[PDB]
Amino acid sequence: GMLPRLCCLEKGPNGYGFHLHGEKGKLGQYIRLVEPGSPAEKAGLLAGDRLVEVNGENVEKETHQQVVSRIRAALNAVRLLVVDPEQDTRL
């Protein structure tokens, strides 16, 4: 579709079930290691997706630490707006 994917994740016993990672000396947080059967999987996250917003706030220029803090601050739920970096670029 035209609108980016919005993944709404409900925290489970063992968390959301994904890793968030950045690259060295570069902005951008990306999804990896989406656990089978997890809230992350069920919401439609895929490894390689680039995170654009967390709960309605743009994180494209935030540090790893800042983004993790925002996801953990939503102590039970989170809405992640994500894009496929091979198909979407911020200018």
Q: Which residues here bind Cl ion, judged by CB under 5 A?
A: 32-33, 47, 83-84, 87-88
Backbone angles phi, psi at 57, to 5 degrees: -125, 135
- DSSP class of residue 87? T
As a whole number of Å, the end-to-end CA separation of the chain is: 20
Whole-angstrom Cα distance, residue 18 to residue 72? 13
Q: Which lies closer to Cl ion via its Cβ, residue 23 or residue 73?
A: 23
User: C-beta of 76: minimal distance to Cl ion in Å?
Assistant: 25
Nearer to Cl ion, 2 or 75 (CB): 2
- Min dist CB 35 to Cl ion, Å, is 11
Instruction: Indicate the SS3 state at residue 66.
Output: helix
Question: Shortest Cβ distance from residue 75 to Cl ion (Å)?
Answer: 26
